[PDB]
Amino acid sequence: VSFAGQLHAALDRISDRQAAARVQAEKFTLGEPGIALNDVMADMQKASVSMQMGIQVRNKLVAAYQEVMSMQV
Amino acid sequence: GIALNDVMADMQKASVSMQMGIQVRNKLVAAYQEVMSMQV
Amino acid sequence: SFAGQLHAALDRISDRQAAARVQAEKFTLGEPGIALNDVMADMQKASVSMQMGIQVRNKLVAAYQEVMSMQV
Amino acid sequence: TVSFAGQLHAALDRISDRQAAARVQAEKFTLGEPGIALNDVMADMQKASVSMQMGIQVRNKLVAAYQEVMSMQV
Amino acid sequence: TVSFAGQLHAALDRISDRQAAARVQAEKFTLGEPGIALNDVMADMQKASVSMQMGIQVRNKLVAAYQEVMSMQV
Amino acid sequence: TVSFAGQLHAALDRISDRQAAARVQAEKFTLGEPGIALNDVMADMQKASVSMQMGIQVRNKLVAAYQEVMSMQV
Amino acid sequence: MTPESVMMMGTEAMKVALALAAPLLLVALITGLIISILQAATQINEMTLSFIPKIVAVFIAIIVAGPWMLNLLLDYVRTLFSNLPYIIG
Amino acid sequence: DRLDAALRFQQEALNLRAQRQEILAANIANADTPGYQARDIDFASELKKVMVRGREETGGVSSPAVDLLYRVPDQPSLDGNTVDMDRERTQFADNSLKYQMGLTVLGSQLKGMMNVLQG
Amino acid sequence: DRLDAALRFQQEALNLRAQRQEILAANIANADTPGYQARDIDFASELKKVMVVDLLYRVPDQPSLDGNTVDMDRERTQFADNSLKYQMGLTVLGSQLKGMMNVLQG
Amino acid sequence: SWSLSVQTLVFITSLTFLPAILLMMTSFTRIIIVFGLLRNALGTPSAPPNQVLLGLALFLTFFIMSPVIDKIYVDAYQPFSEQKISMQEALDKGAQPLRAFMLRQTREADLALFARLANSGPLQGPEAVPMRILLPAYVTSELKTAFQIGFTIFIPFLIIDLVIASVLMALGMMMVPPATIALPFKLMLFVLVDGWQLLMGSLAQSFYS
Amino acid sequence: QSWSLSVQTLVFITSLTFLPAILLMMTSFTRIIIVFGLLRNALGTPSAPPNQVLLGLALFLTFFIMSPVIDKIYVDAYQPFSEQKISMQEALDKGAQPLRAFMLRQTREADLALFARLANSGPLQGPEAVPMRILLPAYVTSELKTAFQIGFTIFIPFLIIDLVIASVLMALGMMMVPPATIALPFKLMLFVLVDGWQLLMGSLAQSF
Amino acid sequence: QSWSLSVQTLVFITSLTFLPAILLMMTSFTRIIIVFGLLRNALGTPSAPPNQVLLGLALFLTFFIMSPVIDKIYVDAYQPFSEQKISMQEALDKGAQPLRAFMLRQTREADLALFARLANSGPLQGPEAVPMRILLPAYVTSELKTAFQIGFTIFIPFLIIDLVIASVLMALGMMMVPPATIALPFKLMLFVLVDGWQLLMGSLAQSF
Amino acid sequence: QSWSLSVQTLVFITSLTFLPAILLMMTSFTRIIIVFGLLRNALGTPSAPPNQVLLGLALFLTFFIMSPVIDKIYVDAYQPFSEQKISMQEALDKGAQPLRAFMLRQTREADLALFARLANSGPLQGPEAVPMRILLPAYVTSELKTAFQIGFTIFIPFLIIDLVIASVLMALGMMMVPPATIALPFKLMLFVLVDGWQLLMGSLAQSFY
Amino acid sequence: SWSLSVQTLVFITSLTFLPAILLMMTSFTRIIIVFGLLRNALGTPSAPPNQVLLGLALFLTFFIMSPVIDKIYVDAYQPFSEQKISMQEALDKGAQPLRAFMLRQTREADLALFARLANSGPLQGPEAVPMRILLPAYVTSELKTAFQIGFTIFIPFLIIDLVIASVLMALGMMMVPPATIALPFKLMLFVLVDGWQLLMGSLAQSF
Amino acid sequence: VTSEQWLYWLHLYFWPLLRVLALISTAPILSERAIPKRVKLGLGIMITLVIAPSLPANDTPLFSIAALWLAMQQILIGIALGFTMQFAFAAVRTAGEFIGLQMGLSFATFVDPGSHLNMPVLARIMDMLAMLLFLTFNGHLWLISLLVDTFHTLPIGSNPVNSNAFMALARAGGLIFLNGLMLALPVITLLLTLNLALGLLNRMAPQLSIFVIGFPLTLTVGIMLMAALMPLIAPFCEHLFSEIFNLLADIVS
């Protein structure tokens, strides 16, 4: 609804993806049937990419905030 | 859906446009304060 | 005079940038006879020239501000 | 009578001479000259880069000092 | 009788002795002197680098602090 | 009664005891004492490294905030 | 907070200023008038001899009433700073 | 407008590189599927087409408006697929390097601009 | 510490894999001892127990005359599988630590 | 809850905005403006080398915001550190005591104005005011209070100059600058009436009243 | 018990950021710099000696005044810490003592009482119970008050010269002259014939 | 004992950082700058010569005055160091001696005694062993006093001119005519006729 | 013998910082602005034209005065530099000579002799062998003296007007009338009718020749 | 058309000289000098703040440049969008109204002096005066015009001061300073005739 | 998904920020240098955060001359509002300085105009009293509200503009004088009479009066007169604020 709401939604989505990948990895390590190593490894890959995207967005956002707070008034 | 190629490119533009706006406003404000700091 | 020399320098820098951009554009389409190393070298030379122009502008602006701040 | 301008000119000439020697050696090595080795070329280039960086830093400190001194209110 | 210049001189000298000791150890190992091990050579070189970086950081902090103190309007 | 200095001391203690615990585990594993596993040694060392990086980043943010607050003019 | 309070504190402030400045100004005025009437009686006219006793009189005025002014102004400032957090809006 | 127009060629070329690599990865994935003709796109013609007329989609299941052309097979196969692995891996590596080149050019231009907006 | 809670599962899995690897290699080494029983642990149950060791005897397949119940093929496959899973656990733990690191680097 | 990587990222990012919290959500602002105005009043635009005033203001703010920080720690930081309250709920729990302090000092007129500017519905009680309305209302109230305090501070230091100029003018010394004479007397006044203890106590009461 | 060496390095290099703050708030730099600024204002010329010279001179004066405290800290904290005989935290606690005594000796009672009132302090007892976070602001307030007390009486002779010259000039008749213009050389004469700089340094040092 | 090369360049850059402080507190820059500012104030023209012009003039005059000291440092200290004859420590120690001698030549014994007694230094036999930490503040104070003396003396002819023009205007009855407007052109004429600029620079150089 | 490109760029950018110093100590600017600083005092209005207007007018006048010197530098030195027929060192050596001649022709011999004696320089055979370290401060000194001469001469007609107005005011018994406010409009009259600004700039330009 | 980055560099660089453009190219100097002289006339050098005078001069400058701004909009702002003309040629076309204005407000003597200061012999036509010769001449002409307007403003206040002093002297007073008496009368004359609005009307008419 | 279109948010949050910050840097009390710069920037940012989502977003690119025209428009609106508000304090300062000059407080201006020796202490007194009154009447809130309201009258999008309107603000320069006299008309008048009275004393025995008896008497009389006149400014203060506000409302449109 708002910018803070959108950022919170993005953080929740990224954390949920990471938790899903971690839970599937723990389930595979547990020995439970039906969980394939292919899916585990691909989901870990996707979670890493999403984390890196979030890190880049945070870096820029902080840079833009620092730029604005340097604006002369 | 939208891919990283588009997301990153628009993100960078927006950063560039915001920096341009900040610099232009800073120049305008500096000129105004130099004018008003005059001595008549 | 001085404005003419500044205009000539700016024109040379922009011609550098335009040549590099056009060469990279032609190479992107797959046109033959343009090599990657030449494209990268031209891009870096254009960047160096533009940075030199930026630095010269900064020094000139600082000098003008310092001169105009004197107490007559 | 020691003059600072003379010392600055000497330092600039030394930096330029080192850079020119490294550039000439690299050019000769590229042209297939026998009595020049790659490790010497790279080491000389790195030494020239270090010297020029030292010159740049000294110039920056000198400019900062000059701009601080000339900004006084007497 | 505590002089800050004295302590700075002591720290600078200690860094210099560490660097010189590492340099001499590497020198001797290169000349093939028995009794010198490569692992100790590399470890002492890295310790010398750590000491020099610590000196660099201390100098940076001191110079910054001096410039902030020295630029106030009296 | 909260104490920011007390909280910083507690955090620094947490980091230091984590590092010391990892170091002592490596000590015992090098000495050959049974019951210590190499993977546990490496994992504890990496955990200590992560904790120290946490501390370094918090230090950077706090120092930057303090400097920006103290660089302001009233 | 109310404009009545603002104007009351301003008026009291400037009456304090009047009380602080009235002895010195009045002493100077009386000395000048006395010297002027003496000049008129004696038919003497130089614009500089009226400036001489005025300084001495005004400087004596600080000797005699100076402590009173210093005690009044400090009391005013003390009360103003103490009542500052009760006239906030 | 001006900044958008100046950075539009390399951005569109990089997007087309991404789509071409998606197609090449699809060809590599289906390399053992019987009865699969390898697909590829003409990069230059499609790039000029996307610049003159903006990007468009068939639906939006969604897919680009690019023309998926068939690659000429090298040698016959009984199963009936024309995915020759040498061609696929050469085009994959070439597209990889060209995408990295596009990233380098675009990043250089954007820094070349932040340098100016840097006072 | 919260950092321990995030990395507790993978550390315990890695340690359990190392212990079971040692047990399997002990089974391989003592293949020729007459009267030696092949022992093993149930990985999932012990992982539950540590997160919230006991050795279980392996069911013999072929009856030998010297009382040795160690089977080469079964334990060789288990040894290779445990090596693979140890590598996978190392990979996952390293990825988690590297992510926690790139979050901080800046 | 969020993954530990996300929690660390959010914590590190939130550590950036500390000056913003100090300036726009804390007592620091009306603890400074008064200092700047007083320095303008005494005629010594440098005197207490800034940094000195900033340190004094920081210590004053730390002493003043102590109950709010204590309430935040006991209600939000303690349960969060003991893994009883998630990271996304500790922030919401701790934003309430700061919001209440921000209200105890924020005037009304500002609240009504910023409730009207947002086109929000009627706010029958203070419990319906969101942070988006309280933040700038609190900022404006703090600015107005600081300026009121400074402008009543300014009066005696101008009174002294007025009487000095009048006394100088009585004797005909029309070419004597009054500021040079008034500055030592202004310093003498600020020495005599416990210049700083009274100001410190007045500011502290101005917060707790 | 002792901190790890990495923790020690982190704390040590982070603490150097508060060096200007320590020098300003905790040492004698504030009083000397305020007195010097007030003296320039009192000389009739606002920027005769450049700020750089005054800042360096104040730094040297602060070092000379605090040398006994620095020696006590070195004997108590720095030397036994560097020889690896005490930990870092205990060294800091031991070294905070002479600086605490120096800060207390120049602290006004009213300042300490007020800042203990604002910090909810109840039964304080021995002068050796005041915490650092309470002692520091009281010391700063006392230093500001003392600097103002010194400055307003440094102002006195120059006001005397100004008033005497203005009175003589106007009583003589030349009321159109600016008295400050004629007075400035005489202010310089008074400052140089009294040895104003040397005596001012002597007084500033003796003030402790 | 010789510092390694990286330590040497670290010392060199850190010392180059302190260049303005050395110029202000060890050379003759401060006295010339103070005298120039006082002279500008004395002519009634507070901003006629721009600050940069006077700063450049003071820098050139300082370079000319300190040329013998720089030559001594080059010949005795820097030249052997540049030919690798002596290390950096001994080169710096040898280079300190000419600059100290110059600073001791232009200091007052009373200020040296004040700073020695303040720093609790033991008895020092002769000028040979006086620490730089003691000599630098004393030299700065002596330079300040000498600069104020020179400025106050310079203030005299313009005071004579102002007084004589004010008296001439007053004896004519011109009660409301300010004397500054008439005095400023005559101050300029007086300074021009006596060849004021070169004479004052020569006097400043001769006093060193 | 030529410097490397990196060293040339470093030297050029470093020398770009000395532009205000070169302008003040080497060009006509010092004589112009100083005279303006006095002219606004003679007219009785310290406000006068704004400071920036006078500074820019002085800059334009300086450029017009140094147009011949700039042209000679461009022809003799910078043109071979752009057309690759000279190095940076030789260009620096050659381009300064016309500027050195320009500085020398406005340099009083007494100041030059003073700075020689003060540098303990050997016997200079002829003007051509004068070092720049000796020519620069001597030129600045002579520049200041000439500017003060021009300013004092400028101060004359306004002094005439002030004296005449004051004498007229006092001869009528109007002793209590300050003549400065009355004489200011007549000073403006004098500067307007005679075309003071154009005449002054023409006089300055001719003075430099 | 040259590179976009170079265009950005040039634009931000030219943004710095905005005070120079306001002072040297527009009329701002004239109004500011007129305001300063008028303030000096009333005898109160700090009655309206310098900030207020600067802002009033800024508003007057904006109105009196509004026709030139409109011509710039027609010749430069609009065709730069339709791309019939663009870049430096359009910049020169947009600067042309500024010349025309500065040619209108510049005297011939200043232009002649600054031409003979630049050895520009063949400058025959009057619409091809270079900027280097046009700018300082325009500034000097503005200074002369502002001083003339200031003297014209000075005349009535000087008359009032003289009249007040003469009546004081004729009435027998020889010691009363006439400035104190004449100040409120100066103000009541300035307000009653509504000096300010007629002054701005004349300045607008003064072009 | 994961779009977060940045250009839309930037164009929505930029121009209102430009206008709000332009008002902030010039509006009285909100433009005083004592406020730290970051506080002003944060106040502008938060006000824009509250206001902008309700406004229609503009789509003109930041890399166009249209963006420059928009920025110039916002700066003009903000500075016009702030300056029109500042005119009232200018008028109060004028009245105070004139009362002080008739006090004879700074006599050196009559002999040396602008000679670095002037102290309008009464002008400062009534200036800060006027600032206190403006704070009491919550004028700054009104200013912020009107800054918001000028959108409905004049939207962010480039709109055509008028002329004599600028004159109005410039013609407001008359009010500073006119209303200024309205604040000084009583007291100065009586002071005038006092000076007239002093003239009657000088018509007696020559000299021996004025500069020796007139100055202290007139100083004390001015002091007590305008001390009694202090209660009078507040209705005039409200009158000045109302004049500025309705002139702004009428002319901005």
Numbering used by the authors:
A (entry chain P): 32 to 104
B (entry chain K): 65 to 104
C (entry chain L): 33 to 104
D (entry chain M), E (entry chain N), F (entry chain O): 31 to 104
G (entry chain D): 1 to 89
H (entry chain Q): 3 to 62, 78 to 136
I (entry chain U): 3 to 54, 83 to 136
J (entry chain J): 37 to 245
Paper lines:
Given the high fragility of the C ring, we examined several reagents as the media of density gradient centrifugation in the purification of the intact C ring-containing basal body–hook complex in the default CCW state from our previously constructed ΔfliCD strain of S. Typhimurium, which lacks the flagellar filament, thus avoiding effects of the filaments on purification of the motor. Local refinements of the LP ring, MS ring, rod, hook and export apparatus generated their high-quality cryo-EM density maps at the resolutions ranging from 3.0 Å to 4.3 Å. The MS ring is located on the inner membrane, houses the export apparatus and forms the assembly base for the C ring. In the intact C ring-containing basal body–hook complexes, there is one more peptide loop L3, which consists of the residues G310–P322 of FliF and is also extended from the β-collar region of the MS ring, bound in a hydrophobic groove that is formed by the α2–α3 linking loop of FliE6 with the D0 and DC domains of FlgC1 and FlgC6 on the surface of the rod. Thus, there are totally 11 FliF loops that extend from the MS ring to bind the rod in the basal body for torque transmission.
